[PDB]
Design a binder for this molecule. Structure first.
Ligand SMILES: Nc1nccc2scc(-c3ccc4c(c3)CCN4C(=O)Cc3ccccc3)c12
Length: 248
């Protein structure tokens, strides 16, 4: 089909239960792209849902949202292709892994990163959309270093709000919970992978390393709020963006 004819596959970038993402070079324009292939549901109503979802996402233009290029269908069982700007190999998880000391995690740089994520989320919320899948392995950097919120719309539960885990009804407030943990994680580097999971699961339960609360008193209170078991109590993305910790 169009994919094999117009593109040269380079490598596989990711494989969820949803679909697959490939790096592919367009033969005509010579640029490399990230192309997600999704198996389309056989049922009529489920297909219409997905096709409306595509039409909503295609309208999205924001500094913190990956640039969209094209979407199309191909028959084998039908597949939906979505062609997006190719971000860097190193995602936010990799970024944090390569910087394991306090000196390597400068306050300003970390907050500038978090702010861009938070602004992308605020933009989606204001449109009536939620992200649902905010985690460091799904947060990207463009070639020119702009932070991008990852794949969404159509893995660990470590960043997933309690209500979202339990299959309970939920709102945009789920993204705020995810934001809290990411803010903590940006400011608190880890020696080992096991320390990371040990500490993060505690932070989910509102139990904080005493060195974090003393070094980051303001953002501690903020993270505490964003991590309420009760979604109503979590602040709006706009409130977080306008918080005093992002003054300068
Ligand atoms: N863009 C990417 N660059 C490098 C590696 C990877 S791994 C996954 C992606 C990626 C990122 C974002 C998105 C996708 C793959 C598919 C759809 N999409 C979105 O952000 C959703 C969206 C679709 C259409 C318009 C706006 C947003 C990736």
């Amino acid at each position: 089909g169009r994919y094999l004819t117009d593109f040269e596959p380079i490598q596989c970038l990711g494989r969820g239960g949803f679909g697959v993402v490939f790096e592919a070079k367009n033969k005509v324009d010579d640029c490399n792209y990230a192309i997600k292939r999704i198996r389309l549901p056989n049922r009529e109503l489920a297909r219409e849902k997905v096709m409306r979802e595509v039409k909503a996402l295609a309208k999205l233009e924001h500094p913190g949202i990956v640039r969209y290029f094209n979407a199309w269908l191909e028959k084998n069982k039908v597949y939906l292709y979505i062609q997006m700007q190719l971000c860097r190999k190193e995602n936010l998880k990799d970024w944090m892994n390569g910087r394991c000391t306090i000196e390597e995690r400068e306050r300003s740089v970390c907050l500038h990163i978090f702010l861009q994520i938070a602004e992308a989320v605020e933009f989606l919320h204001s449109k009536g959309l939620m992200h649902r899948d905010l985690k460091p392995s799904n947060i990207f950097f463009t070639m020119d270093d702009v932070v991008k919120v990852g794949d969404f719309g159509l893995g660990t539960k470590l960043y997933m709000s309690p209500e979202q885990i339990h299959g309970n009804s939920y709102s945009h407030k789920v993204d705020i919970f995810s934001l809290g943990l990411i803010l903590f994680e940006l400011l608190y580097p880890f020696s080992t992978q096991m320390e990371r999971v040990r500490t993060l699961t505690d932070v989910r339960n509102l139990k904080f390393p005493p060195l974090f609360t003393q070094k980051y008193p303001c953002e501690y209170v903020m993270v505490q709020d964003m991590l309420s078991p009760s979604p109503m109590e979590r602040p709006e993305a706009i409130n977080i963006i306008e918080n005093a910790v992002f003054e300068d």
